[PDB]
Each structure stands twice: as structure tokens, then as C-alpha cells.
Amino acid sequence: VDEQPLENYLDMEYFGTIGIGTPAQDFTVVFDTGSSNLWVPSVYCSSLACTNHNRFNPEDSSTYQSTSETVSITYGTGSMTGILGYDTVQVGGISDTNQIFGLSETEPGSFLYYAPFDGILGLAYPSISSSGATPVFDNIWNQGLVSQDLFSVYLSADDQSGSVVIFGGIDSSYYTGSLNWVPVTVEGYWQITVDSITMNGEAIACAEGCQAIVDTGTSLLTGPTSPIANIQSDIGASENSDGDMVVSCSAISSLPDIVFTINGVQYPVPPSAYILQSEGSCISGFQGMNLPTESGELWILGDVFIRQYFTVFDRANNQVGLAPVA
């Protein structure tokens, strides 16, 4: 049972140390269930972000194989272009040989410059992988390096250690009860149906069902701007001068749980999880961001949700498994 420990950065980001190449060069990567590519900065990159992060050198690796292929990825926050190469990636005690990954050439902007991590390790489906590059978990499975074709995530709260990604296993000590299994609707992101979102037995959004993605790489609970506007009023959040959605800290004690009903099961998120503490004031864990797809407009069940529920991502049966954290 192969475990990758993750560091918690201010309850906003979760990343861990991987080794790429022979001998291994170390990187910090976001373990991200909302994307499917692996990339790190390389010596071919001269953008500001590449000057203050760890840079892969293909010339120091006996196992590096080059391609003539490039990759370009756009995230919610930032952009990279790079070249695809093959090497051994050491992740969670697994030696993932013949792993295609991106070596950055450009990392425009300021987000990637101030971020504590060097790259991203995507854990979603091959269908959303830029340049059809094989994701890490797919290459681990295809080579028969695990027995169970699932990984499970535990994300700690309140800046504590203990977060992990467990490749090729589950560990019962992290959750109370038994796992509830939810079918993936569309195989790209880890996409599921939410039946309704409620507060005190009244639907506040997604009254007749909506599509959501379970994303380790998003900090907050995200949804369409219009439903999010109602939720912000419902919790007494007001916009301030800096642009932030503030709520009275004192008011946590009188707010109801918001309930996410998934596959006929109730998943409550308490006010102490969905209102966050940032600098003596308290802000809303809800963010409006319109993401249109073939299957309507998406909600993101970000880290605010995943902290409350141990999550198992099952590729053999195309299911997400949820249970309350211990």
C-alpha cells in the first residue's frame, strides 16, 4: 500500500515531492484531480516562474528520452507551454518508468511565480490530457505497478500534516462508516451528479440536479455566478472594497449546514468549513465561476468539500467513493 504524503499550504493547496529522472531530481507538484497532465519547469524556461522554482535538466538524466512534441496547458490561474519528454517518475514509492511529461519552456504571469509548488500532477482521465499525453495514474496501471486501479485522498484541515494520496488502495482509519459509491457521469474530470443543494430543508441551488467535479486542485466551492449570488445572500455575505465576500465571524454559530445530496445521500458542510478565516476577518468559501460544458454548467467540489469527506477515485468501475473523515 503505496502512500504519497502531501503538505498542506494554508488550506488552499496540497502538494508533494516527486522524483523525476536517473538519478532523481526532486519537484513539488499539486496532486490535481481536475487536470490530467504532469509537468515540471525545465532548464529551457527563462520566465520569472522558472527562475525561482526547481528546473528539470534532461542532460543530468541517464533515462531521459526526447520527443519533437509540445504541450500547451491553460488553467483557471495561469498558462504553460513546454516540450514532451519520457523519464522515470518516482511517486508514492512507485517507480513509474516510461512516463511522458512536460518540460516547461514558458510559464507566463505572477500566480506560478508566488506559488510554493513547481508543477502539476493531474489525476483525472486521459480524455482531457493536453497533447493526448498519458496521465501518471494511467501509466502506473498500464505497467501493472498497482493491483487495485484506484487511488484515495485524505486532505487535512487547519494547516496540519497528515494529508495523503494512497495509490492502489484505501485505508479505513481515515474515515468513519462505510464508503458510499457515486457513478462518474462523464469520463474526463471526476464528474458526478449532485441531486440538490439545501439549507434547512429548502433548495438554495441545483433544485432538480446538477453536474459537479471533485477537484483536489480547487481551494473553494465553486458554481455558476447566478446560484452562487443567492447562496452568498443566504449566508449574509457582502462584497467589500478589496473585492472579497465577507461574513461576520461571530455569525458562524447561527448558520445552518449546507447539504449536498449525492446519489440520495446527504453530505453536510458545516459553517466552520464553508466560511474561512483570513486575517482577523472571515470570508465565504463560495466562488462564482461559470464553466459551460456539454452537460450544462459545472459545480466544483473543491478542497472545502474534500476535507470533510475521504474520497476514493476508482478507475476500474468509474466511481467516486465518499465517507466522512475520522
Side-chain angles (χ1 to χ4, degrees):
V1 66
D2 294 300
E3 284 194 8
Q4 176 69 46
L6 308 179
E7 193 184 320
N8 181 337
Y9 185 79
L10 293 174
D11 295 345
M12 290 299 127
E13 288 154 18
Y14 296 87
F15 53 84
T17 305
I18 63 168
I20 307 179
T22 314
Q25 295 174 59
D26 285 357
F27 301 85
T28 50
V29 296
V30 173
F31 278 79
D32 183 16
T33 63
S35 69
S36 307
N37 292 96
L38 167 62
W39 64 271
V40 291
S42 76
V43 75
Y44 301 144
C45 187
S46 297
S47 315
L48 281 172
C50 298
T51 71
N52 77 157
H53 291 89
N54 296 307
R55 291 196 300 159
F56 186 68
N57 188 343
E59 168 250 278
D60 296 319
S61 181
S62 57
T63 41
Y64 188 75
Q65 296 179 275
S66 39
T67 81
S68 323
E69 286 293 317
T70 61
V71 69
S72 194
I73 315 150
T74 315
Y75 298 100
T77 38
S79 168
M80 72 82 67
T81 71
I83 59 158
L84 293 168
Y86 287 82
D87 216 329
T88 312
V89 177
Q90 276 166 247
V91 53
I94 300 158
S95 285
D96 173 25
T97 53
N98 301 113
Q99 180 61 53
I100 204 167
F101 72 103
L103 289 77
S104 72
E105 286 193 286
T106 71
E107 289 188 44
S110 53
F111 183 71
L112 293 177
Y113 181 80
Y114 290 117
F117 59 87
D118 304 320
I120 288 157
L121 195 152
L123 292 167
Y125 283 93
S127 57
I128 61 157
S129 193
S130 301
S131 301
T134 309
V136 167
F137 199 68
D138 289 76
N139 204 59
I140 289 170
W141 178 250
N142 292 152
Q143 301 185 282
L145 298 174
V146 295
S147 314
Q148 287 183 68
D149 191 16
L150 59 78
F151 61 90
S152 78
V153 178
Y154 173 60
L155 302 188
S156 65
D158 300 307
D159 203 87
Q160 308 291 9
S161 44
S163 307
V164 286
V165 179
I166 310 164
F167 288 98
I170 295 156
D171 186 347
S172 285
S173 55
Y174 292 104
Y175 61 98
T176 60
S178 198
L179 285 157
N180 306 290
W181 296 96
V182 195
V184 176
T185 52
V186 185
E187 291 176 20
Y189 301 113
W190 290 97
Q191 196 172 322
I192 57 158
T193 302
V194 176
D195 296 328
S196 59
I197 299 166
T198 64
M199 211 175 89
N200 288 325
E202 201 70 20
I204 61 178
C206 177
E208 284 188 86
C210 57
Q211 293 300 288
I213 73 163
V214 177
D215 186 3
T216 48
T218 291
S219 314
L220 305 185
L221 249 33
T222 300
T225 50
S226 158
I228 294 294
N230 294 18
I231 297 164
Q232 309 288 28
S233 308
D234 294 331
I235 66 169
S238 56
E239 202 186 358
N240 75 17
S241 322
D242 305 86
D244 309 317
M245 289 288 191
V246 286
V247 61
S248 182
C249 286
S250 311
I252 289 164
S253 313
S254 52
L255 281 167
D257 293 352
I258 288 164
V259 184
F260 285 94
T261 304
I262 308 165
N263 203 33
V265 180
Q266 283 189 239
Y267 292 99
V269 185
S272 58
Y274 76 64
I275 292 163
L276 304 152
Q277 254 110 264
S278 193
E279 300 155 52
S281 60
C282 296
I283 53 86
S284 175
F286 286 97
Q287 183 178 77
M289 196 165 102
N290 286 73
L291 302 106
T293 73
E294 55 181 66
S295 46
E297 294 196 289
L298 294 179
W299 295 61
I300 316 320
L301 305 174
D303 297 326
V304 172
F305 184 89
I306 303 153
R307 273 190 293 264
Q308 305 301 305
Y309 299 100
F310 182 78
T311 308
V312 182
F313 296 94
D314 184 16
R315 284 290 305 267
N317 282 142
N318 301 299
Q319 281 175 328
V320 175
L322 299 166
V325 295

